[PDB]
Design a protein around this ligand. Structure first.
Ligand SMILES: Nc1nc2c(ncn2[C@@H]2O[C@H](COP(=O)(O)OP(=O)(O)O)[C@@H](O)[C@H]2O)c(=O)[nH]1
Ligand SMILES: Nc1nc2c(ncn2[C@@H]2O[C@H](COP(=O)(O)OP(=O)(O)O)[C@@H](O)[C@H]2O)c(=O)[nH]1
Ligand SMILES: Nc1nc2c(ncn2[C@@H]2O[C@H](COP(=O)(O)OP(=O)(O)O)[C@@H](O)[C@H]2O)c(=O)[nH]1
Ligand SMILES: Nc1nc2c(ncn2[C@@H]2O[C@H](COP(=O)(O)OP(=O)(O)O)[C@@H](O)[C@H]2O)c(=O)[nH]1
Ligand SMILES: [Mg+2]
Ligand SMILES: [Mg+2]
Ligand SMILES: [Mg+2]
Ligand SMILES: [Mg+2]
Lengths: 397, 397, 397, 397
C-alpha cells in the first residue's frame, strides 16, 4: 500500500507515546506476535546522525489503506533537533494535545517546526478525554486548537480533530473514548494526510555535484534530480555563485545509456549545449528557467551543536561568519542574531538571519549546515527569504 | 452547504457544454429543479468586464454535499480572456478531454492558465468514451493526461480521471458510460476540489490604499486585508517603491472603533508606530515581516486588448514601457516579448517578461493591467518571478 | 369454425386461379362461399403495403370444418413480394403443379419461400389431369413432387397429393377429375393444414416498443408479446445493442390492471426489477434468458423497391449502408451483393448478406426493411444467420 | 419395424416401473415382447457409461407398428446422470404423473432435462387413476400437466395424455383403468413420437480426428461427418483454437476411393486446398462457412462424479480449472459456480458457467467431460451460451 511517514508531535506528557502504542496495538490486533509496547517506545533508540544525538522511536503499522512509518520522540529537544536536522522525513503530523492541559509551549513550537519543514497537513488528537470533568473543556480546546493551527499556517477550520483517550485505547477500555477515537484518528490520517510524492510535477531542480567533458560532445554536469522531470531538449538555467546561465539540456545519461528523460531521484549526467567546463562548477543548480532564483538573505531556524556533538565550546555573536553548506554548494555567510540575543549558546536553537557572500539557491525549507574551521557548528532550516535591506548589500566582506 | 466555483475547460468540441448540460439535467432529477439545456448553455450570453467582452455560460447545481457555480465558455478566446482577467473565482476545474482526440492545444493552454491563476486541483473527464472501441486508446489517453497534469504542475497520479460519455449521460442512455461517469465525476469534484477559504492562515497582507495622520496619535494606512489576520501589536513591514520599512501596528480601526484584530476582507485603518505620513504611500503593501519579497522582474501571461476593447491601436514591440497597475500601486515597467514573437498581437495573449523600474509586491497569480497613457492595452497575471539578471539591471529608461 | 389462411402457390399457368375459382364454385352450391369466376380472381386487385404494391386476390370459402382466407396471386413477382413482406399470412399452402408440365422453376422457388416464411404444411394439387395421356406421367410427377417436397424440408411422403382437373371442376364436368378432386383437395386441406396457434410454448419474446418509469414502482417496458407466455416473477433478458441485461419481471400491466400473466399477442407494460430508464431503450427484445441469441450477420431474400414504390431510382452496389428496421429496432448495416452480382436493381429481389453494426434479435424468418434516409429501399426476410467472419468483425462504421 | 428409442420420466414412486412392467405384459401376451416383471425392472441392470454408474432398466417391446428400446431408471439421480451423459438416446419420453400427487419437482426437472437434450416429443401417462376418487382431481391434473408441458416448450395442447392405473393393467384388472389405458398409451406413443433422422439437411460438421499429408496432393483431415452432406468442391471452415481458416474440400476419400460426396455418419478423409499440416490439428471442427460459431462461455448442467466413479474426492470452489473434453478437442476451463453456490459436491449436479481459454465448437445440447489430471471429475451438457463479460475476457490462465 502507499507508504506514509508520520509522527506524533505536541507538548511533553500529553500522550504522544500512549497514542503511538495504542495505534500499534489496535492495528496489530488483526493478528500479531510482536508489536512495540509503550515502555518499548517510551525508551527509544539513540540515533547519531552527523554527530548529533537524538532519541527517536520508529514504529511501523498499517491501516486498511496505507503503510506508515511513524516516529515518536521522548523529549522536546529530540523533536527540535530532529525536525531542524531533517533526519526523519515527514508527510504529516499527529498533533496530540491533552484536553486538561490544552495547547502548551511545545505544542506551538512543534507546529511551527512542522510548518517550516514542509508539513502542510496535521491531524489533531485531543487526548486524555477520560480525565476531563467538563465537556466544555473539550469544545473550548478544539476551538483554541483550530485558531492555533490557523495562527501557524495550517487550515484550522479544515483540520481533522479527534477527541479521545489514548490510554483507554491502549488498555482496551471504554471503546467510545479509546478504540473508537483511535480508529477515527487513523481514518482522518488516511484521508487528510497526503501520500508522499517524488514531486515530479514541480520545476526540475538539479544540484550540480560535478562537471566533466566528453571530447566531441560537450560539457556534462552530474547530479541527482531533487524534483521534477528533466527531458532531453529542455531549456535549463544554472543558478548560484552570482551567475545565471541559460541553455538547453541536449542529452541525459544514466547507466551509460542516453535517455530522453530523467525524474526526481535519478543520479544523472546532463549534457548541456554550448557551455564549456570552466563555465560551470559543483554548487550551481540547474533548474527550469524562471522557476527559482538565488537568495542571499535568509531567516533560518538553527540548532547550534554542543561541544559534545563536536560543535563550538563557546557562544558567538552577531556577524559571526561561518561557511554554509547546502545542496552541493558551500558559501561564506554572516549570522545575525535576533534583537536582544547578544550571544548564541551551543546546544541552543534559534531563529537566525543569514547573509551569504553570494546569492545561492537557498529555498525556504531547504536545510544547511554551518561550518567554521573543519567542524559543524550548526544545522538549520531556511524559514524565510526576506528582502535584502539596503544596509545588507552595503555589508563588508 | 459549502459553495464552490468550478468550470469546464478543455479544447473546443471535446464535450465541455455537453458535460455541463448532462450534469444539470442529472442533478435536476427531482426536487425544485429547473435546469438549463445544451442549447441554452452553448449559446452562452456575452458579458463585459472592464471593457472586455466574453461569452460565458453560468449554471448552478448542487450535489448532496455542495453547491456549485459552474462556468462554461463557447470558445477558447473566452477562456483565455476570462481566466487572465480574473473576473470570477475558480476553486477547481473540470478538464474535459475527448478520448478519440486526446489532449489538444487548448487542453494544454487551459491547464497552464488554470495552474497560473491559482487553481490547485482539477478533475479530468475523459469524454466520448462511446466513440472508442479500443479501451487501449482510453488507457493511453489517461496515462497521457496524467503526464500532462504533472507537466503543468498538477499531481497527475493523484488527479481524479473519469472516463465516460457526456452525450450518453445527457441523452440518458448507456449508464455505465453516461450517468455513472457523471456521478463519479461529481463525486471526484466534491472530494478533490477544495472549498474556497479566506486564507486566514496565510501571512497577513494589506495593500495600502491611502495614508493619513491623526495629530497626537500617529500615521494611519488604510486598506483591505487580502489574507491572513492582523492583530493589534503585530510587527509589520511595508514593501514597495524600493523601501523596506519595519514597524508595528499599534492600532486597528474600523467603523470608528478600535479593534484588537482584523482579518482578510476587512477594510481598515491601521495606526503604525514611529513612521510619519511622508514615510508611506498608496501602493506599498503592509505584510507580516519576511513573509513576502518585492519583485522587479516577472514573467506573466498577458492579454493584449483589442482596438475595439479600448486596447492599443499599434501593436507594441519588445522594450515598450507601459505603466503597470496591480494591487493599489502603479509602476513603470519594460516589456520583453517571448522568444519567437516580434510583436504583441492585439486581442492575443502571450507570455511576457516584465521588468519594473522598482521592486513591488508582485506575487505569482497576482493580476495587473498595463496602461499606455490613460488607456489599458493589456491585462495580465504573474506566472513567475525569474532571477533579475545583470543585464536586466543595465537597462535604463 | 376455426379460421385458416391458405393460398395457392406454384408456377405460372399451372392452374392456381382456376383451382381457386373451382373451389368457390363447388362451395357456393352449399352456401359455403360466393362463387368467384376465374376472371374475377385472375384480375386480382392491386394492394399497397408500406409502399410495396402487389396484386393478390383474396377469396373466402368455408368447408363444413373450417373457414378459409385464400390468397391467389397473378404473377411470380407477386408471390415473391408477398411472402418476403408477409403481407398475406399463410398457415398452409396449396401447391398447384400441372401434370402435363410437371414441376417448374417457380414451383421450387415458392416451396422454398414458403419454407423460409414458416409454412410447414402444403397440400398439392396435380392439375390438368384431363391433359395427361396416361398415369405414367402423373404417377411420375407425383413421385417427383414428393421428392421435391422432401428436398425443401417438407415430408413428401406424408403430404397429400390430389390429382384432378381444376378446369373440369370449374366447368362442372368429369366429376372424377373435377368435382371429386376438388372435394378431395379441400378434405386434405381441412386435415393436413393445422389451425394457427399463438406459439404459447415458445420462449417468450417481447420487442421493446418504449420504456417509461412509474415513481415508487420502477421501470416499465412496453411491447407486444410476439410468442410465449410471460408471467409475473419470470426472469428475463434484454437483448440487442450489445447489451446483456438480465432481471425479473415484477409486474405486468394491461388495461391499467396488474396481471400475473400475459400471452402472445398481448400488448403490455412489463415492470422490470432494478433497471432504470437509462438502462433500456426501444429496440431491445426482452426474452426468456438464453432462449435467443442476437445475430449481427444474416443472409436474406430482399425485395428492392422501385421508385414508384418509394424506393431508389438507381441501383446500389455491394457495401451500400442503409439502416435496417426490424421488430422495434433500427440498426445500420452493410449489404454484400451475391457472388457475381455487381448491382442491386430497383424492383428486383435477391439474396443479400447483411452485417449489422451491432448484433440484434434477427431470427430466421424474421422480416425487416432497409431505409436510406427517409425512404424504404428494401424489404426482406432473414433466411440464414451465418456466423461473423474475421473481416466482418473488422468493419469500420 | 421402425425403431424408436424411449424411456419413462417422472417423479419417484409415480409408477414409472409399474407402467414399464405393465407394458411388457400386454405386449408379451399378444406377441413376443417377453415381459420382465416389476421386480426385475424395479431392480435395473446397473450400467456404466465411462465409469459413470447408472442403474438403468432396459426393456424391448414391439407394437404392430414399431419396435421400442424402452428404459426405466430407479432413482432421480439415475435419470439426471443418464440424460446429462446421453448414455441412452431418446427420441421420445413417456412422462408418468401420479394423478393423486400431480406434477412434482422431479416431474419438472425431467421435462427440463428432456428439453435440454433435444427431446421434442413426450407422451403423458397420468397414473394411479384408481387411487383418485373425483374426476375433477384428474381433469385438473391434466390441465396442470398441459400447462407444465407448455411451460417447458412442449405443445401442451397436443401432447397425448393418457389416464389410468398401471397397477391394474399390470395385475390385469379393471380394463378401463389398466389394460385399455396402456393400450391408449402405446397407440399415442406410436403416433406422437416421430422417427429419428441422421439429419442430412443441416450444415455439414466434421470434428477433426487427425491430420495427415499426401505429398503432391495436399493436407487431409479425417473425421466422421456428424451431420449434413459434404461434397467435393464445397467450401469449408476450420473452427477452434481461435484459428478461423477457410478453404475448399478438393477431395473426399473413403474406402481408398475418391468420392464426390459424403454424408452424416461417414468416417472420411477430406483433402483441403493450400493448407499445410501445421495449419491444422485434431480438435478443430470443419464446417460449412458461417454455419456455426465458436463459444468460449457456456452454462451447463454438470454432474460431478463421486469418488467411487473417479471424480475428485473433494468439492471445488468457483475457482477451479479442470480440462474440458468435447468432440475431438480438449481445453482448459474455469468453472464459475453460479451466484449463491459456494461449492461443487461430488455426486451432485448443478448449473455451472464454464469459461474456455479459447473459443471452441461447444453448442447448446453438446456434451463434454471435465478432467482433473487423468481423472474425470464431471460430465456435462451445454444448456446455454452466455456472452463473455468484459470481466470474463480479462481472465488470466
Ligand atoms: N488519564 C489519561 N492519562 C493518559 C492518557 N494518555 C496518556 N496518559 C498518561 O499521561 C502520561 C504521559 O503520557 P505519554 O504518552 O508518555 O506522553 P508523551 O510525553 O506525549 O509521550 C503517562 O502517565 C500516561 O499514562 C489518556 O488518554 N488519559
Ligand atoms: N460521440 C460523442 N459526442 C459527444 C460527446 N460529448 C459531446 N459530444 C459531441 O461533440 C460536439 C461538441 O460538444 P460540445 O459539448 O459542444 O463541445 P465543447 O466545445 O467542448 O463545448 C457535439 O457535436 C456533441 O454532441 C460524447 O460523449 N460522445
Ligand atoms: N386442360 C386444362 N387446362 C387447365 C386446367 N386448369 C387450368 N387450365 C388452363 O391453364 C391456363 C392457366 O390457368 P390459371 O389458373 O390461370 O393458372 P395460374 O397462373 O396458375 O393461375 C388457363 O388457360 C386455364 O384455363 C385443367 O385442369 N385442365
Ligand atoms: N394405487 C396405485 N398404485 C400404483 C399404481 N402404479 C403404481 N403404483 C404403486 O406406487 C408405488 C410406486 O410405483 P413404481 O412403479 O415403483 O414408481 P416409479 O418410481 O415411478 O417407478 C408402488 O408401491 C406401486 O404399487 C397405480 O396405478 N395405482
Ligand atoms: Mg513520549
Ligand atoms: Mg461548449
Ligand atoms: Mg393465376
Ligand atoms: Mg421406479
Amino acid at each position: 500500500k502507499p507508504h506514509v511517514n508520520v509522527g506524533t508531535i505536541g507538548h511533553v506528557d500529553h500522550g504522544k507515546t500512549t497514542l503511538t502504542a495504542a495505534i500499534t496495538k489496535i492495528l496489530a490486533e488483526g493478528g500479531g506476535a510482536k508489536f512495540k509496547k509503550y515502555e518499548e517506545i517510551d525508551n527509544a533508540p539513540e540515533e547519531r546522525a552527523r554527530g548529533i544525538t537524538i532519541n527517536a522511536a520508529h514504529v511501523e503499522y498499517s491501516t486498511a489503506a496505507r503503510h506508515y512509518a511513524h516516529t515518536d520522540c521522548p523529549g522536546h529537544a529530540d523533536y527540535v533537533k530532529n525536525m531542524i536536522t531533517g533526519t526523519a522525513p515527514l508527510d504529516g503530523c499527529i498533533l496530540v494535545v491533552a484536553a486538561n492541559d490544552g495547547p502548551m509551549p511545545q505544542t506551538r513550537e512543534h507546529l511551527l517546526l512542522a510548518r517550516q519543514i514542509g508539513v502542510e497537513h496535521v491531524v489533531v488528537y485531543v487526548n486524555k478525554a477520560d480525565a476531563v470533568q467538563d465537556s466544555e473543556m473539550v469544545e473550548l480546546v478544539e476551538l483554541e486548537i483550530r485558531e492555533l493551527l490557523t495562527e501557524f499556517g495550517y487550515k484550522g477550520e479544515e483540520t481533522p480533530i479527534i477527541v479521545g483517550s489514548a490510554l483507554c485505547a491502549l488498555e482496551q477500555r471504554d471503546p467510545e473514548l479509546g478504540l473508537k477515537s483511535v480508529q477515527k484518528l487513523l481514518d482522518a490520517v488516511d484521508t487528510y494526510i497526503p501520500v508522499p510524492t517524488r514531486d515530479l510535477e514541480k520545476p526540475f531542480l538539479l544540484p550540480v555535484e560535478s562537471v566533466y567533458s566528453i571530447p566531441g560532445r560537450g560539457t556534462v554536469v552530474t547530479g541527482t534530480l531533487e524534483r521534477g522531470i528533466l527531458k532531453k531538449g529542455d531549456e535549463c538555467e544554472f543558478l548560484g555563485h552570482s551567475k545565471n546561465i541559460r541553455t538547453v539540456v541536449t542529452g541525459i545519461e544514466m547507466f551509460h545509456k542516453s535517455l530522453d528523460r530523467a525524474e526526481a531521484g535519478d543520479n544523472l549526467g546532463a549534457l548541456v549545449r554550448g557551455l564549456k567546463r570552466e563555465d560551470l562548477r559543483r554548487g550551481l543548480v540547474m533548474a527550469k528557467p524562471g522557476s527559482i532564483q538565488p537568495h542571499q538573505k535568509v531567516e533560518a531556524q538553527v540548532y547550534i551543536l554542543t561541544k559534545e556533538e563536536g560543535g563550538r565550546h563557546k557562544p558567538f555573536v552577531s556577524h559571526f561568519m561561518p561557511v554554509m553548506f547546502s545542496l552541493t554548494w558551500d558559501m561564506a555567510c554572516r549570522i545575525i542574531l535576533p534583537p536582544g540575543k547578544e550571544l548564541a549558546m551551543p546546544g541552543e536553537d534559534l531563529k537566525l538571519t543569514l547573509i551569504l557572500r553570494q546569492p545561492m539557491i537557498l529555498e525556504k525549507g531547504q536545510r544547511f549546515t554551518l561550518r567554521d574551521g573543519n567542524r559543524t557548528i550548526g544545522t538549520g532550516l531556511v524559514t524565510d527569504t526576506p528582502a535584502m535591506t539596503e544596509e545588507d548589500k552595503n555589508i563588508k566582506w
